[PDB]
Paper text:
Viruses from the family Picornaviridae form non-enveloped icosahedral virions that are about 30 nm in diameter. The capsid proteins VP1, VP2, VP3, and VP4 originating from a single polyprotein form a protomer, the basic building block of the icosahedral capsid. The entire capsid consists of 60 such protomers, arranged in 12 pentamer units. Here we show that the exit of the RNA from the particles of echoviruses 18 and 30 requires capsid opening and results in a loss of up to three adjacent capsid protein pentamers.
Specifically, we performed cryo-EM of echovirus 18 virions exposed to pH 6.0 for 10 min, mimicking the acidic environment that the virus encounters in endosomes. Asymmetric reconstruction combined with 3D classification identified subpopulations of echovirus 18 particles that lacked up to three pentamers of capsid protein protomers. We call the particles lacking one or several pentamers open particles. The missing pentamers always formed a single compact opening through the capsid. Reconstructions of the open particles missing one, two, or three pentamers with imposed five-fold, two-fold, and three-fold symmetries, respectively, were determined to resolutions of 3.8, 4.1, and 3.7 Å, which allowed their molecular structures to be built. Except for the missing pentamers, the open particles are similar in structure to that of the activated echovirus 18 particle: increased diameter relative to the native virus, reduced inter-pentamer contacts, absence of VP4 subunits, and holes along icosahedral two-fold symmetry axes. The capsid proteins next to the missing pentamers are more mobile than the rest of the capsid, as indicated by the three times higher temperature factors than the remainder of the capsid. Residues 1–42 from the N termini of VP1 subunits, which were previously shown to interact with membranes and facilitate enterovirus genome delivery into the cytoplasm, are not resolved in the electron density map, indicating that their structures differ among particles. The N-termini of some of the VP1 subunits could reach out of the capsid through the openings formed by the missing pentamers. The openings formed by the removal of one or more pentamers are sufficiently large to allow release of the viral RNA, even if the genome contains double-stranded RNA segments.
Residue numbers in the entry:
A (entry chain v2), B (entry chain C1): 3001 to 3073, 3078 to 3175, 3187 to 3233
C (entry chain j2): 3001 to 3060
D (entry chain t2), E (entry chain A1): 1043 to 1122, 1132 to 1275
F (entry chain B1): 2013 to 2026, 2030 to 2043, 2048 to 2257
Write the structure that this text describes.
Amino acid sequence: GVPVLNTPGSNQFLTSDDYQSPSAMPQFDETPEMHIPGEVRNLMEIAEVDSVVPVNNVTGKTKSMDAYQIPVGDKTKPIFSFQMDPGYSSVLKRTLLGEMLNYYAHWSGSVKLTFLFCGSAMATGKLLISYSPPGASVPTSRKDAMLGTHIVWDIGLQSSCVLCVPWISQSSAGYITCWYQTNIVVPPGAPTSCDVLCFASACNDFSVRLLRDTPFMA
Amino acid sequence: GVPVLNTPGSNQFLTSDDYQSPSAMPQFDETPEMHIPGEVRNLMEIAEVDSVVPVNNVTGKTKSMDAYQIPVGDKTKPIFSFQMDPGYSSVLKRTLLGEMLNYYAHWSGSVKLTFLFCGSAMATGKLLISYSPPGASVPTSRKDAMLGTHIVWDIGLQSSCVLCVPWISQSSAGYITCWYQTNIVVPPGAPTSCDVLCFASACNDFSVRLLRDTPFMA
Amino acid sequence: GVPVLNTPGSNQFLTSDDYQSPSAMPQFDETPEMHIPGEVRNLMEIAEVDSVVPVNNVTG
Amino acid sequence: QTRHVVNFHSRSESTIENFMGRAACVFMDQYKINGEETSTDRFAVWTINIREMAQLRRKCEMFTYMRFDIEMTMVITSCQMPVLTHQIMYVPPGGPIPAKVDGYEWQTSTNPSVFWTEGNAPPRISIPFISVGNAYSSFYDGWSHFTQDGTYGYTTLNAMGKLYIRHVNRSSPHQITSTIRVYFKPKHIKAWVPRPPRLCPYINKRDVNFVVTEITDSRTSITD
Amino acid sequence: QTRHVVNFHSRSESTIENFMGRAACVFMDQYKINGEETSTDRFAVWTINIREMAQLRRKCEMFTYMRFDIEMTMVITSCQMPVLTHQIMYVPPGGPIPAKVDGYEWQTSTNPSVFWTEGNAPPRISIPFISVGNAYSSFYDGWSHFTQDGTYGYTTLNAMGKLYIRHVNRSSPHQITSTIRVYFKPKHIKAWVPRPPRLCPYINKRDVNFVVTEITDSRTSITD
Amino acid sequence: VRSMTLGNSTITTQNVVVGYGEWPSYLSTAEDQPTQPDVATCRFYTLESVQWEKTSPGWWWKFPEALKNMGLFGQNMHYHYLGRAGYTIHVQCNASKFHQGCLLVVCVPEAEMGCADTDTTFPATELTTEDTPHVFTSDSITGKKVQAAVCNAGMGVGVGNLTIFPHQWINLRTNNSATIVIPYINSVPMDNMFRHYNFTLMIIPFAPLNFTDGATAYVPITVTIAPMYAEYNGLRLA
C-alpha cells in the first residue's frame, strides 16, 4: 500500500501530546450540556476579583481574623508597609491574585489596591499612602514619603481609595507604606480606634506564561 | 484502515533529517520577537567585512600587535610576500575571511586587499604591488615584477590602494609581493620609518559549499 | 490518528525497489550540471556503432 | 536571579484547558502473574476519582462544577519467559467487578478493555463524560441518603468508573511482578463556579476535613 | 590533491539555519537500574546549555544573540531480563528537580517526559524558545547580582532547563547499565550581532577565561 | 567645520558610522510605562583626555556606567533601575601634521572579558573605573584582574579581526575624528544600568605613534559621548 517510514519519536509516550485518543465507549452518547451559571473560561478571571489582604500578619495574629485588620488610632513610624509582589511576599502570596500567580513562573502586569476604611461615620482624618518604585529605598519619614509618589487620602470625604501599581513581574519590588498625615478626629460619642481593610486584584489586564507546580502543597 | 508498508529506513535515526519534532510544551506560547539591531541572515556577510591581516607574523612577533604592521623605511628584496589563499596560509588563515572559510571544504571566489599606509602626512614614496598568477613563479627582482601585473601605488597622493584577486578556490596559489619603487621621502620634522596595514575580505560575492568541522579547535 | 495497518511486505528489504531514500546531506546543494559532449541516453546507441569483426579468429 | 523586563501580553496558558489538561501519574500498583489462585494481589483496582493526589486535587477544587472527557495512557513494566500481554478493563459506574483474577466479569462484553502486549506503544483508552448530571461536582454539601443519614459529601453523580488490570497469561515458570502507572488527563474540559484555593493540608481522600492552619507566614511587625 | 576549477555560485549552505542546525552529540552518561537506593548514579542530569563541547560552543559564539527551538533525540543503549522502558524528563527553568531515582518530582505534571521502551525508534522531544528575554545571549558582560557582586557573566535569561533520565523499571535480577547520548539540534534559528571567532582554547565551561595565544602560526621571515 | 550643540554643551567637529545600519529610537502599554527625559541627558559628556604615547597599547571604557558620575544621566541611573540609550561617541585626536599613527575605534557590544589567571574571578573594580579608562597591556599579566593583553583584547579573539563591530579608523595621515552611533543592542527592551555593560568602547593603536625629537611626546585622544533617546521606567502610579 502506501509506503510510510517511521520517524524518530514513533511508539513513544510524550506526556504532553494532543493526539486523538480512541474512545472506549463509542456507542455511548453523553448527557446534554445545560446552562450552569458562572462559567470560567480563563484563570485570570479569578485574579481580577478583589479579596482581603492580611497586612497585619504579625507573629501571633495569623490564625485569627486580626490578620486582615490594620489598626488606626505616634506619627513618626508608618502604619503599615509591605513588598509589592504577589509572589515571595508574606502579605500578598495567599491572595486570590497571589495564589493564581504561584501556578506560573513568568507573570507580568499591574495590581490595584483598595483601602476600605472600616471606622465610624463620624471619624475624620488623613492618611498618606506612598509608593516607592522597585529600585528606590523606603521613606524613613513622612516628609520623605510626601516628596515621592503619594495620595493624601481624606477619610472624612471618601472611605475607599484605589491605587494601581505597575511594573509588577518576576521570572526588589515596590512598597506601599502608609502614614499619619493627621490623627483620627472623633466626636465624644464615636470610638477612637478604627480599622482599615485592604484589597488586591489585577488592575486592567495581567500577563502570565509558564505553568508550574505550586510550592504550598507538600 | 489505510494499508501502509514500511520502507527500508523506518525506525532509524538519521542524524541529518528535517522531520516534525513533537513539541514537549504545546500549551506554551513563546516570547514575541522584538527587533534587535544587526541581524545575520548568511555567513558570507561576515567574510565581506575587512579585517587586519598579520603579514609580519615572524617567529617572535605574533603574540604582540607587531604582527599587523609592515615596516616601511635595501631595494633589492621585497617588503613582504605571501601566498594568496585564505586556507592553509599562515597570513590569511585567521582572518574573518580565512576563518569562515575553514568551516567549509569547497569554496571559490575573489578576495580584495586594502593597503592602508599608516605613515606621516608628509612622507612620500612609491610602492609597487605585484600579483603573480597561481601557476607563475614569484618575481625575484623589481623589474621582473614590473613586467607582470602591478600597481605603482603613490603614497603621497592616495593612502589606501585596493586590489581584487580572482581565481581563489580550493577543494599553488597567487602571490602579493610589494617592492620599493622609490624610498620614503620625508621632511626634517617627520619620522623616517612608517607602517603599512593590510586588509582582506570577499571582493564581490563568494561561493562556498561543503560544511566541515574546523581544524583549529582540539 | 490515521488508522493504518501494515501489509505483508512491511519492514522488508526488496533489493529492486524505487522508494524515496532519506537524503543524508539535505543542506548540501550539488554542483550544477554543465553540458558535456556525447551523452548516452540508451544502451542500444552503442550497438548501432559499427566495429570490426574478428572473422579470421583461427587458433593462432 | 535578577528582575528583568518581562514584556509580553498573553493569557493562552491561563485558560482552563491549558491549566487542567495535563497528564499526571495518579496510580502506581503491583500485580503478580502466578501463585495464590484466590488472591487480591494479582490485579489492580483504582476507582477513578479526581481526589487521588493532592497536587491535581487542588486544581480541581478551584472550580465547583466541571465536565471533561478523560484520556488515560497506562505505562506498564515488568520484573522477575514469553512475551507478556496485559488487560486493562474499564468498568463503567454500572458494572460488575471481578473478585479474583479468574472471575467471569473479565469476559463481560459491556466492560471495554484493551489487550496490550509488551514492547509496543503504551495503551491509550479514552472515556467520555459518564456522569448522570450535567457536570462533575468537586464539592457536594449534601447527604447521599435522604433524611440526613450517613455518608456526608459523597454524591453518586461524580462517579467515573473503575480500572481493573491483569495479565492475560494464565501462568509462568517463574514470578513476574508487573508495575502499572496510570496517566490521567482531563480533556475538552469546561468549568463553572470558581472557588477560593485550598489553604490547609489534606487529611483524607474522601472528605474535606482539615486542621486549622494559619492564613499566611508570619512576619515580625506590621511595618517591616 | 590538485587545484581544480571549482565553478559554481551558491551560498545556501552558508545561511544560519544551514550552519547551526546540525545534530551533535552533547551528553554521554551512565545510569544503573538497581542497588544503592539513595544514590546519584541511577539517573542523569545535563543542565541544557550551548557551552557543552567546544566544537559547537565555537559556532554559537560567532553571534552575540540568537533564538532557536531545540529538538533533541536521545540514543539509549544497555548492557549487563525483561524489555526495558526509560523516562526522559525535561524540567523547565522553573521546575523541581529530583534528588533520588524515587523522588516525587518524577510525577510532576508540569515536567513533560517521554516513556521510551527499548527496541523502537529513538525518542524525540522538542522544546520551544523558553527564555524570558527576546533571545539567548551567548555572552553577557554583566553581573547576576546587583552592585557588582559575584557570578560574573552568567545571566538567567539564557537558561534552557534540565533533562533527568531514568529507568522506570523498579528493579532487576542482575545489573543493567544504560548509556544515553543526547543529540542536540538548534531549529528555526535566528542570530544577531556577529562576532569574531574564538582564537584561544577553552578553559572552563562556565566562563570566557583563556591563555594568551599567538595570532597566527609563525613563519621565518616577512618575505618567504 | 561643524559646531554641533546639544543643550548646554557645544563641541567643534570636522562621516558617521551608524552602528548596524540603525539609528537609536524609542521603544514604541499601561502595565509598564517608560519615562522619556529628553531634557539634559542628550548633552555632550566629554571625558578626560587620554595621552597617547609611543608605548600605549590601548584603552577601554565600559558603558552605560562609564557615565555613572556624569551629571543628570549619571543621576537618573540611581533613581530608575531600567533604561536604554544610544550614545553618539565622538573621538578626536588633534595631533599635528608630523605625527603618524592609526587607531581602531570600536564599540564591541557584550564584551565579556576574561580573568588574567584562570580558575578564578576578578573583583569587579577591574573592568571599570567609571570615567577613567583601563589600559591594555603589551604582554600577558597575572593576578585577579582582566587579561588585558592586546592580540587577545579582552574576549580571547584576535585583535586584528575586531573590525566586525561598529568601528572607525583614525589614520593621522588623513583624518583625526571618529563618530559612532550604537542603537542599544540588547536582548531585553530595558535593562539595569549598573549590572549590565551594554558595550565596550575600546581604542586600540594598530600602527604605533611616531615622531621626532622636537614634537610633543604624546597625542591627546578626546572622547565625547551623547546619550541619545534615553528612556527609563515610570515612577508614577497608573
